[PDB]
């Protein structure tokens, strides 16, 4: 009780000093960030040596007082003095004490049952240990060529996110009292908020610590590291024990976190979405963004939107680049061409147009590049370095591991090189590859012959032979490349040499973004053709625990099931704004208006007519018995409500299974039609998901009843509205302007509001109108 | 417990069988997955597990397959 009083009196003393008073008054609160930077700048010159000098003394250490007197005896066992009443050296409320007392309280101290609290705070570290438990071992030795520079996620963890948003999570989970109300992350990514805030908020221990450790928990460290060719981010945590220049170890890849495959699943998701945008070429800009913002991903423990995964994902695939290009995410330093990845290390030049002949006696324009340019090629199990000058490869070296992958590197990079022989081979190219069939769209030519090579096996041999072939001289024996990808060096290709080893990958920290052309082409950096149109033509539909919406062009939607699910979505979505909606009715305790709601009449005809009254009786019963506060489940009210509309008859027959066009919805008992999720706010109707954030008091949501309750917004500061703590905000009803302290000290006012709507579309439609 | 399967504590999932659908008996689980089976997922922290992460990953590979 005096803990606040003494703080108030301390403030009185401080503002009584004018020198501190004016510097406390003048300026924003941000000056604290500077003020803290003005202290304890002095550091000792010697890292260990000064510490040795420190521990030499018997009572060097600064330690707290109150806790020790509370728990344990200050005096010693062996009669070596421990405690005094004197505060010496720096003057702070801590009194000095000997080092060994720490060991004593670690021995005989009276503490119990801290075990479970520790681990899930440090689950980053504890997990990095758990993974080492399951692996097996083998030892050998070799002269090993490691891949020298890869920038690769190390210490990977599920639900990894950017630094700013993880700072938001930090603020929300640490303390509610001072926090800003942060829309973008909390609205979309809620349910990780529920978990983290739930486990860490109830037991107030080591607030700062837990914060700064959670910062590192979700932050994969991507550094520039040597790897020996196992690129899974789990092996990156401990490379040292595994591999090195002379090192080798075995039996690893098996154990991994669930992230590594989930990322690939997201790559397939972006594949299907980009195909959906490919189906209709009327406009590719307006549709794909809809397909993005609509889709909802289910991560193993959490539901998260596709937008915040795409924009903020680490790995840039040829597809992922396309999915990001629709949004405002800037990810550069990546070149994607077909399956191959590329990086540009040198030179520059302009795109020029040259019309060259095919074998069908027809002329088609080819856009080529004249530059002296040195780029690094990247393909599966193979790396290389190429340099092109004036539309023809100048210098080439291959660092690839496998012969076939070497040949693929050579080929693809010849396609991007576009020599004259590129025109000479045209075996039936025009009949199909010339005109891609999509609304009669002519597909670019580099990708045309790329696809011609991806077609069959002999097409690779064609252009492989299109390069000059010569018997290589002695001294090139090891560097020479056969037609089939080997080193025998009897016959070899011209202007190419293999290297024994791998080839290092360049890295640049850069962000570049520009809008995309209507054909799924990204002209970013005023050129550079990074989007590679369609990378791979996989026609397949397979998904697991994935959500789609809004005329997806994939038919998962039955007529009866869309009647049920949309009928529910009317009720769930349309309510929560104000009076004559579910929240005000629940606060009034009046459930009769809730029965008569016009959105229930929409759902009425879909119920089974036989038991309609028999269902309505038990339904009305359940809704009425939950009107008493604290006993009501807020999901069960949505589940049970639609059947209450009809006149209750005394059935005496059990109404557990409610047939709505021959499909049952049970109380509790999450099923195909109605999925009732535990300990988070959501729900699943077959292959799709919906939830309503602003007003949920459902009893299991206790941990965030302060975060979830917000549908509010800011209006004006004019009324004098009693200053209400965040826990007092649940009581003030609708249309009530109230005053609240926000964040780091800025105070604003709100009312019960219709939520912020059309953050994007509001601008997008007008921008489309102005053309 | 040396039996290859669990007896007393084992749990059942009932499906009314079609002659032409169940005649395969391999597709039986494919028609099972259209039910509630697909949703069940274990947590990362098992009770009494020897090799949790391996088994969990394999389970996800079964569900994906």
């Amino acid at each position: 009780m005096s803990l606040l009083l003494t703080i108030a009196k301390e403030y009185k003393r401080l503002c009584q000093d004018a020198k501190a008073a004016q510097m406390m008054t003048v300026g924003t609160v941000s000056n604290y960030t500077t003020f803290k930077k003005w202290t304890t700048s002095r550091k000792e010159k010697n890292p260990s040596l000064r510490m040795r000098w420190a521990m030499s003394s018997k009572f060097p250490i600064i330690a707290n007082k109150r806790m020790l007197e509370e728990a344990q005896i200050p005096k010693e066992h062996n009669n070596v003095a421990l405690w005094e009443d004197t505060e010496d050296v720096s003057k702070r409320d801590h009194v000095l004490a000997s080092a060994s007392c720490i060991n004593y309280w670690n021995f005989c101290g009276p503490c119990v049952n801290n075990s479970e609290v520790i681990k899930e705070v440090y689950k980053s570290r504890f997990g990095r240990l758990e993974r080492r438990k399951e692996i097996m071992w083998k030892e050998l030795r070799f002269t090993l060529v490691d891949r020298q520079r890869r920038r690769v996620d190390t210490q990977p963890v599920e639900q990894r996110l950017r630094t700013g948003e993880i700072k938001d999570l930090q603020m929300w989970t640490l303390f509610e009292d001072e926090a800003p109300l942060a829309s973008k992350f909390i609205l979309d990514n809620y349910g990780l908020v529920k978990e983290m805030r739930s486990k860490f908020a109830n037991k107030p221990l080591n607030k700062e610590v837990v914060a700064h450790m959670l910062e590192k928990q979700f932050n994969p460290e991507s550094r520039f590291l040597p790897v020996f060719g196992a690129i899974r981010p789990e092996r990156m945590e401990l490379i040292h024990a595994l591999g090195g220049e002379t090192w080798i170890q075995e039996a690893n890849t098996a154990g991994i976190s669930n992230v590594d495959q989930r990322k690939n699943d997201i790559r397939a998701v972006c594949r299907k979405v980009c195909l959906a945008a490919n189906a209709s070429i009327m406009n590719a800009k307006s549709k794909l963004v809809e397909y993005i913002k609509s889709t909802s991903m289910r991560i193993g423990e959490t539901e998260r939107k596709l937008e915040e995964l795409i924009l903020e994902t680490d790995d840039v695939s040829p597809e992922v680049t396309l999915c990001k290009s629709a949004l405002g995410g800037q990810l550069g330093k990546t070149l994607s061409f077909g399956p191959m990845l590329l990086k540009k290390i040198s030179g520059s030049g302009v795109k020029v147009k040259d019309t060259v002949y095919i074998q069908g006696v027809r002329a088609v324009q080819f856009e080529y590049w004249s530059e002296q340019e040195e780029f690094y090629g990247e393909y599966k199990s193979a790396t290389a370095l190429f340099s092109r000058k004036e539309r023809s490869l100048e210098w080439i070296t291959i660092g690839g591991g496998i012969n076939e992958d070497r040949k693929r590197l050579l080929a693809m990079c010849m396609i991007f090189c576009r020599d004259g022989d590129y025109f000479k081979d045209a075996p039936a190219t025009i009949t199909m590859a010339d005109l891609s069939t999509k609304l009669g769209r002519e597909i670019p030519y580099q990708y045309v012959m790329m696809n011609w090579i991806q077609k069959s096996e002999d097409n690779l041999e064609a252009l492989l032979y299109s390069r000059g072939i010569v018997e290589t001289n002695p001294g090139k024996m090891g560097s020479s490349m056969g037609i089939d990808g080997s080193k025998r060096a009897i016959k070899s290709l011209r202007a190419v040499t293999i290297q024994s080893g791998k080839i290092d990958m360049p890295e640049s920290k850069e962000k570049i973004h520009l809008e995309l052309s209507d054909n799924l082409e990204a002209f970013d950096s005023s050129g550079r053709i990074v989007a590679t149109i369609l990378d791979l033509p996989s026609d397949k539909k397979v998904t697991f625990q994935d959500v789609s919406f809004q005329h997806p062009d994939l038919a998962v939607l039955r007529d009866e099931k869309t009647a049920i699910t949309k009928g529910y979505e009317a009720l769930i979505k349309r309510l929560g704004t104000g009076d004559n909606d579910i929240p005000s009715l629940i606060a009034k305790k009046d459930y009769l208006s809730l029965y008569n709601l016009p959105e229930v009449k929409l759902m009425a005809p879909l119920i089974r007519p036989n038991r309609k009254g028999v269902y309505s009786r038990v339904a009305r019963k359940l809704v009425s018995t939950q009107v008493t506060t604290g006993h009501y489940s807020l999901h069960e009210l949505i589940k049970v409500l639609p059947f209450t509309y009809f006149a209750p008859k005394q059935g005496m027959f059990e109404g557990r299974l409610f047939f709505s066009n021959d499909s049952f919805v049970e109380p509790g008992v999450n099923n195909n039609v109605f999925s009732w999720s535990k300990a988070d706010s959501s729900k699943i109707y077959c292959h799709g998901i919906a939830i309503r954030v602003p007003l949920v008091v459902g009893d299991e949501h206790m941990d965030t009843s302060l975060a979830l309750l917000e549908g509010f917004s800011v209006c004006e500061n004019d009324p004098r509205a009693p200053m209400v703590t965040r826990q007092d905000l649940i009581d003030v009803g609708f249309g009530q302007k109230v005053r609240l302290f926000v964040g780091q000290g800025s105070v604003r006012t709100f009312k019960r509001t219709a939520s912020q709507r059309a953050a994007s579309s509001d601008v997008n439609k007008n921008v489309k109108k102005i053309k | 417990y040396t039996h290859k399967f669990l007896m007393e504590e084992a749990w059942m999932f009932t499906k009314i069988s079609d002659p032409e659908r169940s005649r395969a008996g391999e597709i039986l689980i494919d028609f099972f997955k259209k039910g509630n089976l697909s949703a069940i997922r274990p947590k990362d922290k098992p009770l009494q597990g020897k090799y949790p992460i391996h088994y969990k990953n394999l389970w996800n590979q079964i569900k994906a397959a």
Partner: peptide, 10 residues
């Protein structure tokens, strides 16, 4: 608890 079959796809 004498209750064996359970789950129905329905």
């Amino acid at each position: 608890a004498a209750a064996a079959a359970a789950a129905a796809a329905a």
